[PDB]
Amino acid sequence: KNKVVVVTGVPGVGGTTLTQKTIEKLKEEGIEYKMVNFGTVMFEVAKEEGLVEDRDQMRKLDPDTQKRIQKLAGRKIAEMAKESNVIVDTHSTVKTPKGYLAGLPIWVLEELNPDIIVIVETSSDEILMRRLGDATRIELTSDIDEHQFMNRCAAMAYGVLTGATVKIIKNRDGLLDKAVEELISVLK
């Protein structure tokens, strides 16, 4: 009965902060959503098996054991959903030097079974300027638009394989409060 919701967006789009604010407002109203990050959920599982001590060591792992941890992360999130509604911060695609890599390949969706995929969007201009303010980080607006394109294709495909609705929310400067209200609204 409890919902599984995935929140995605490119670095700098502000989707993590948006979800934290939404859960706070859902809790004023008595609706508990537990927030997790899919990637540290994978890191946690790999430490459980003695596979790592360091988080940089993750992307030096073989493609098989990395496919199994992905599976255990989704199943593990599937387990938390018996005890609370779950909101998962993850990438629709990771922009890697080798190309766009789906954050939820089919073997992860079959275990996770989301009810909603959220795509958090804004203009390339607003995204690139946020990045420059972040003292912890250079790529330009065309590469940012390309990524927001490929993220859309990946989430719609997730929707075709899982049955989740795919919801696009705009997170615009001066209007972050509007993004919260629509996301609260989606989940009620």
Q: Which residues are annotated as a binding site for ATP?
A: 9-17
For residues 77 to 116, the per-residue mask of contacts with Cl ion, x marking binding by CB under 5 A and - elsewhere, is ----------------------------------------
Query: Looking only at residues 84 through 113 of this chain, which bind its own copies when binding is defined by CB under 8 A?
Result: 93, 96-102, 104-106
User: 114 is in the binding site of which of Cl ion, its own copies, none (Cβ under 5 to 8 A by kind)?
Assistant: none
CA 6 to chain centre: 5
* Residue 153 C-beta: closest distance to its own copies, Å: 4
If the CB atoms of residues 19 and 162 are measured against its own copies, the closer one turns out to be 162
Query: Looking only at residues 154 through 183 of this chain, which bind its own copies when binding is defined by CB under 8 A?
Result: 154, 156-168
Binding residues vs Cl ion (CB under 5 A): 9-10, 14-17, 119, 148, 151, 176-177
